Design a binder for these strands. Structure first.
Ligand SMILES: [K+]
Ligand SMILES: [K+]
Ligand SMILES: [K+]
Ligand SMILES: [Mg+2]
Ligand SMILES: [Mg+2]
Ligand SMILES: [Mg+2]
Ligand SMILES: [Mg+2]
Ligand SMILES: [Mg+2]
Ligand SMILES: [Mg+2]
Ligand SMILES: [Mg+2]
Ligand SMILES: [Mg+2]
Ligand SMILES: [Mg+2]
Ligand SMILES: [Mg+2]
Lengths: 56, 179, 107, 47, 50, 95, 50
RNA sequence: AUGUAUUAAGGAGAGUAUAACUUAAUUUAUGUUUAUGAUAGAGGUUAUCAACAUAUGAACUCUUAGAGAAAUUACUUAAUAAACGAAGUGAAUUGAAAUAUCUUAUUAACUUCAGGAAAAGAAAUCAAACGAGAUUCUAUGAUUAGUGUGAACGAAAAUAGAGCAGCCUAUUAAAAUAAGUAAAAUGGCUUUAAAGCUGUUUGAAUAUUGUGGG
């Protein structure tokens, strides 16, 4: 009964336009990249900026 | 309404209610229904007359009638300029009869035709279509023209080529009926 | 030891700041011999400056800046509390840009 | 009242056996010492 | 009330007096009388001394 | 009519086509001329076994004190499907 | 199923909430009848004291 | 009455150990502590002389398949009140010592739709040359600015408190940055003439290298 509702809620996915399908397809790919990370070298350079603008 | 007969397609133009009754000639398997995807914004809770035509965003609005001297208020109504025209659809190739307002008739000429007015993907247009406009949108998607036009726009957007169409299922019921 | 302390200051910033710098790192914090144009971040490739609008090549439409003018003022105000205002890209909300524009041109 | 307590106990032990047997069947399907396919010899004492 | 009547000997469900043990009356006209408990009504917490 | 009118209506009060059953079960079907055909597939029978020689009575002597079952350490003592399947092997292996 | 359990849990609560409203009303009727039955023992003692 | 916490479908009919509740109407088991508790006996109807915690059997009919004169028929592992919320439509009593604009009043009421809340929400916002930085709730600001012949109606900035959260890679899957749109004339709504809502007829531009709104 639920499997027939999730397929009825997402039944409008066959009426999407090409640009509507392209946007969604890109969204899936992007969400796999994740968030970049700050390496120790980059963190060490940011700490210098903080200490220089707070203590001297 | 009383819609014409699509030249090369068994599927008829959907009924105002959403039903798609097939003729008796076309053999149909036991308990087979043609369901249209639900309208994203659902029906219109007031002015149900607009759920059966192309009214855009025009509803029946209420206001006051102001007297010339003392300016006494009396409640009245403003109705949209609703007409009934036969709009041509290049995809179907017939004259789709429907009740459309005069402001939507200017939007059909601006975009280049009924098919171009129904295929808009902007949020403001899908709200202007309405339940009846969402049924015509689904119908033209079954035609080979729009199917061959959308398949060509996926090659320009770098999308993989895109199972059985609805017109093929009905075609497979005419051959199975003779076996 | 001093380098370990610098890493403890960068990890003390709020998550809102650490998130922004990660996806829009300025050339200052990049490696010494790094090239600004190379190893760009997936976010930077979409728009070099998130605060500025960016006309789309195919659609010819001016995409609104990733961070609105309100949010640009919350980054400049949040970065100035931890002395990290030197890492944000050019913004009209920068306290130095606000002051420079007045002295240069005036009322 | 005493005759009604014996009638209630009979309905409690029969409901207990039906559910206990309905679960033993499932538990006996994943048992390596029972072969529910053949009824003639469905059990073999493990070595 | 049952908890008050039995307050001095356990509780209504842990009563520490049983039939067959001599008791002494400490209230009423027949005070300081001594008899043996014959019955023990555990509903009203009343005791019969024959 | 003041008060009796407000009680729940029964079949022993009105006669103008008012029918109400006692949930006795449908034992057949109605014919087109007002008769009834009893479908004996719906009729229920009572299976009473032969009680000659049966020694159990509905009472147990009060000498034998009531005792429950311990099932020590097994939360689902009486409902454990493991102690029902393991007990089956030793006693009755065939069936 | 997880949705079939909510149905049962909801039913078990509806019946227990109705059994409490009935039990409460009975505890008050039975109490009101005993108090009136005991009062006849209080009245006899009050009439004999006067 | 207020506060705190928790929870988010409700009622009736009949029957039954008349403290015990569903035709099983006082089911069956676990663990721990048991007077230094918790807050070396008698007693299975002469009963339940044990509390806490965790499991567990059973739980009828109607509302509530279809039909019907609810608690029936006939079938079947058919099943969800009120108040609260948003939108639509929208009065009158009352005040002006009469009375038409106005006030009563974006009120009462009704109608549709939805959830345990809903709605709203991360500025085409306010400010004034300094700057603030989403929404919601409370008070002050304020019998104020203002409107209106009058009677009356009545903001915002800001401040304090409750909460605090940001984002589009939205923690649940949404944009290739928005055109019959912004806006204009006209008829109304709201209102201070602006902004905002709207029927009819018409109808733009493309980013601070100053395009568009206020
Ligand atoms: K006057
Ligand atoms: K004034
Ligand atoms: K205006
Ligand atoms: Mg009679
Ligand atoms: Mg009669
Ligand atoms: Mg009849
Ligand atoms: Mg019914
Ligand atoms: Mg029924
Ligand atoms: Mg206020
Ligand atoms: Mg825009
Ligand atoms: Mg406008
Ligand atoms: Mg203006
Ligand atoms: Mg405007």
């Amino acid at each position: 009964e639920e499997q027939e509702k999730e397929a009825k809620k997402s039944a409008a996915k066959a009426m999407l336009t090409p640009v509507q399908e392209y946007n969604r397809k890109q969204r899936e790919l992007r969400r796999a990249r994740g968030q970049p990370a700050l390496t120790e070298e980059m963190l060490a350079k940011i700490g210098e900026v903080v200490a220089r603008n707070k203590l001297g | 309404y009383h819609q014409p007969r699509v030249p090369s397609s068994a599927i008829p133009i959907p009924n105002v209610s959403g039903r798609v009754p097939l003729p008796d000639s076309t053999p149909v398997p036991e308990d087979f229904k043609i369901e249209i995807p639900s309208y994203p914004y659902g029906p219109r809770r007031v002015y149900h007359q607009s759920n059966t035509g192309l009214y855009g965003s025009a509803l029946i609005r209420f206001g006051n009638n102001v007297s010339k001297r003392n300016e006494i208020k009396t409640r009245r109504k403003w109705r949209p300029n609703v007409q009934q025209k036969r709009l041509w659809s290049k995809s179907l190739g017939v004259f789709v009869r429907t009740r459309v307002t005069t402001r939507v008739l200017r939007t059909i000429d601006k975009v280049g035709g009924l098919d171009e007015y129904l295929l808009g993907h902007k949020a403001a247009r899908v709200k202007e279509l309405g339940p009846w406009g969402w049924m015509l949108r689904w119908r033209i998607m079954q035609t080979p023209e729009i199917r061959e036009r959308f398949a060509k726009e996926r090659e320009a957007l770098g999308l993989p080529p895109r199972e059985k169409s609805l017109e093929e299922q009905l075609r497979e019921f005419q051959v199975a009926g003779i076996q | 030891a001093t380098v370990k302390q610098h890493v403890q200051l960068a990890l003390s910033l709020p998550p809102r700041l650490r998130t922004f710098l990660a996806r829009y790192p300025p050339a200052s914090i990049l490696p010494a011999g790094a090239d600004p144009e190379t190893h760009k971040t997936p976010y930077q490739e979409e728009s070099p400056n998130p605060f500025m609008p960016t006309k789309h090549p195919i659609t010819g439409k001016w995409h609104n800046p990733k961070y609105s003018l309100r949010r640009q003022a919350e980054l400049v105000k949040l970065a100035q509390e931890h002395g990290v205002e030197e890492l944000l890209p050019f913004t009209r909300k920068l306290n130095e840009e606000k002051l420079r524009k007045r002295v240069e041109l005036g009322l | 009242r005493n005759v009604k307590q014996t009638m209630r106990g009979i309905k409690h032990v029969l409901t207990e056996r039906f559910y206990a047997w309905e679960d033993a069947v499932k538990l006996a399907e994943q048992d390596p010492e029972i072969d529910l396919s053949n009824p003639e010899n469905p059990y073999t004492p493990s070595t | 009330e049952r908890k008050a009547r039995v307050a001095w000997c356990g509780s209504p469900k842990f009563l520490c007096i049983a039939p067959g043990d001599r008791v002494v009356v400490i209230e009423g006209h027949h005070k300081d009388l001594i008899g043996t408990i014959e019955k023990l009504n555990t509903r009203n917490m009343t005791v019969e001394i024959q | 009519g003041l008060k009796y009118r407000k009680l729940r209506l029964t079949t022993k009060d009105v006669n103008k086509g008012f029918y109400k059953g006692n949930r006795t079960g449908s034992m057949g079907t109605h014919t087109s001329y007002g008769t009834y055909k009893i479908d004996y597939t719906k009729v229920r029978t009572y299976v009473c076994p032969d009680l000659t020689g049966f020694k159990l009575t509905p009472f147990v002597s009060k000498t034998i004190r009531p005792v429950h079952d311990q099932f020590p350490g097994d939360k689902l003592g009486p409902k454990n499907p493991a102690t029902y399947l393991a007990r089956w092997k030793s006693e009755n292996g065939l069936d | 199923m997880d949705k079939l359990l909510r149905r049962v849990r909801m039913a078990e609560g509806m019946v227990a909430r109705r059994a409490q409203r009935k039990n409460a009303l009975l505890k008050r009727i039975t109490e009101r009848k005993q108090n009136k039955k005991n009062g006849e023992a209080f009245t006899e003692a009050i009439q004999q004291r006067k």
